[PDB]
């Protein structure tokens, strides 16, 4: 039972291979899980007309970056 | 590079105390082992699972908290804090 115990752990891995597996692991655990929120906020700044009667629109109202 | 190293001199203190300790029951031992006979992707997986609350990951509290510091620098880094 002490050969099926034994396998290969991190430990005895080379500090690079461990290094990369870490990349890769740290990647999908916290990176692809961090969650924020900006959409509306965005959305919101995209669709404000952007001072328009300030600039030198002289015609029809400029459409926003939105549109 | 010395995160790792330092998980890894863990690793090599956990698994001296399992042998240590596996005299007391057989049937512990299984549950003691799933660490070290999972594929190296596994666990390196389980041990990387401190974030949230549940924190069933054998890590050391010292340990998870190098990583909650440069992980909350590379958000700030980032931005996105």
Redesign the interface.
């Known amino acids: 039972?002490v050969a099926?115990?034994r396998?290969?752990?991190?430990?005895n891995?080379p500090?690079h291979?461990?290094?990369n597996?870490?990349l890769?692991?740290?990647e999908?655990?916290?990176i692809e899980?961090?969650e924020?929120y900006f959409e509306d906020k965005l959305i919101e700044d995209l669709a404000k007309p952007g001072a328009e009667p300030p600039e030198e629109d002289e015609g029809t109202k400029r459409v926003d970056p939105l549109h | 590079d010395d995160f790792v190293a330092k998980l890894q001199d863990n690793q090599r203190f956990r698994y001296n105390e399992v042998m240590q300790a596996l005299n007391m029951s057989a049937a512990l031992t299984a549950r003691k082992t799933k660490e070290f006979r999972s594929p190296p992707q596994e666990q390196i997986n389980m041990l990387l699972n401190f974030k949230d609350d549940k924190s069933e990951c054998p890590c050391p509290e010292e340990i998870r908290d190098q990583l909650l510091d440069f992980h909350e620098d590379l958000m700030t880094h980032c931005g996105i804090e």
């Open positions: 039972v099926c115990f396998m290969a752990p991190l430990y891995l500090r291979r461990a290094v597996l870490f890769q692991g740290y999908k655990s916290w899980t961090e924020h």
